[PDB]
């Protein structure tokens, strides 16, 4: 069991779990992202503590166990200031590594652009620098789905009938194909998904589901700013990832010296489909840049 607490960061109380390693060779901060509205689905990275890598988990504002601030603060920029306040409060002036998953990756990209001086490295897994590009790419995935499921999405989706039984069925199929492929969904994942359908941030910022984005960040795009990131960067993405490897390619091209890895047979939550290989790829990256 790691250390858990409820600290006041940037105005509201945030929950965090710091899993220290016997020998702290490095510190790693993690940022979850939709559809997973909590750190729970990222606990599989706890294994790295055996490589001398301390891992910090926490629930961002309005998510998981953390309290919800005002709606006017449901922005990526706000999330950036929150992360910096937490990092400083726990590690002071120590430079740490930052890993981001899904929309947490987009958050990690925004953070790096303004605070890269506090990072020794950046890790983006299934992340993105543009929402419009992510939505465009996810629309292609829909058309690649078998007729039955594809027609359910387009039909009931065009009228906003998200409660439709066949619509819900297609969504489940889509996720089991681009979220967590050929694998038994672990409790950690079900927990993070449950938080999404319970809180408000998801619906407000994102929308009904992954391929149906209508929230306040549907226009978010810092592709013309990530080139300013000049630190060792690792980018991972799955072959069948809901956030296509074409989206990752864009990030890989704006960030000089970045490394791109496309995991075959895997999707979005690659840390559960290839737990050993994933953790081994990240730890090796971390240990090479102390």
From Swiss-Prot:
<feature type="active site" description="Nucleophile">
    <location>
        <position position="102"/>
    </location>
</feature>
<comment type="similarity">
    <text>Belongs to the peptidase S33 family.</text>
</comment>
<dbReference type="Pfam" id="PF00561">
    <property type="entry name" value="Abhydrolase_1"/>
</dbReference>
<comment type="subunit">
    <text>Part of the tricorn proteolytic complex.</text>
</comment>
<comment type="function">
    <text>Cleaves H-Pro-AMC as well as a wide spectrum of amino acid substrates and several peptide substrates without a proline at the N-terminus. Proteases F1, F2 and F3 degrade oligopeptides produced by Tricorn (themselves probably produced by the proteasome) yielding free amino acids.</text>
</comment>
<keyword id="KW-0378">Hydrolase</keyword>
<feature type="active site" description="Proton donor">
    <location>
        <position position="268"/>
    </location>
</feature>
<dbReference type="GO" id="GO:0006508">
    <property type="term" value="P:proteolysis"/>
</dbReference>
<dbReference type="GO" id="GO:0016020">
    <property type="term" value="C:membrane"/>
</dbReference>
<keyword id="KW-0645">Protease</keyword>
<feature type="active site">
    <location>
        <position position="241"/>
    </location>
</feature>
<dbReference type="InterPro" id="IPR029058">
    <property type="entry name" value="AB_hydrolase_fold"/>
</dbReference>
<dbReference type="InterPro" id="IPR000073">
    <property type="entry name" value="AB_hydrolase_1"/>
</dbReference>
<dbReference type="InterPro" id="IPR005945">
    <property type="entry name" value="Pro_imino_pep"/>
</dbReference>
<dbReference type="InterPro" id="IPR002410">
    <property type="entry name" value="Peptidase_S33"/>
</dbReference>
<dbReference type="GO" id="GO:0004177">
    <property type="term" value="F:aminopeptidase activity"/>
</dbReference>
<keyword id="KW-0031">Aminopeptidase</keyword>
<dbReference type="InterPro" id="IPR050266">
    <property type="entry name" value="AB_hydrolase_sf"/>
</dbReference>
<protein>
    <recommendedName>
        <fullName>Proline iminopeptidase</fullName>
        <ecNumber>3.4.11.5</ecNumber>
    </recommendedName>
</protein>
